[PDB]
Amino acid sequence: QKIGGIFIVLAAGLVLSVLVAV
Amino acid sequence: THVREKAIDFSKPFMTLGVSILYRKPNGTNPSVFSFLNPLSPDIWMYVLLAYLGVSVVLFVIAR
Numbered sequence: 202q203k204i205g206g207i208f209i210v211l212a213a214g215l216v217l218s219v220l221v222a223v
Numbered sequence: 224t225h226v227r228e229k230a231i232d233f234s235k236p237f238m239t240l241g242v243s244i245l246y247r248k249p250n251g252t253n254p255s256v257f258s259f260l261n262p263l264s265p266d267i268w269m270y271v272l273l274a275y276l277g278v279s280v281v282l283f284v285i286a287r
Contacts, residue, residue: 203264208274215281 260268
């Protein structure tokens, strides 16, 4: 690791697009 | 040399040459792309391969 490696900020949209229930 | 004139005498010079530069020769190299893997950390170049299929398999499983 030199400049980055953060997969933590990125994982917001993964749980966002699951919404299929009405 | 002007200090060496002060104990012995010089005649006319037979050769008058100067100080050259010796250095060891690198003898060339080849083009390469492992050199291109180096300005970034080499684990990150394999980290590029990881989340590509993280997008891909998630796109595969929710084709429904």
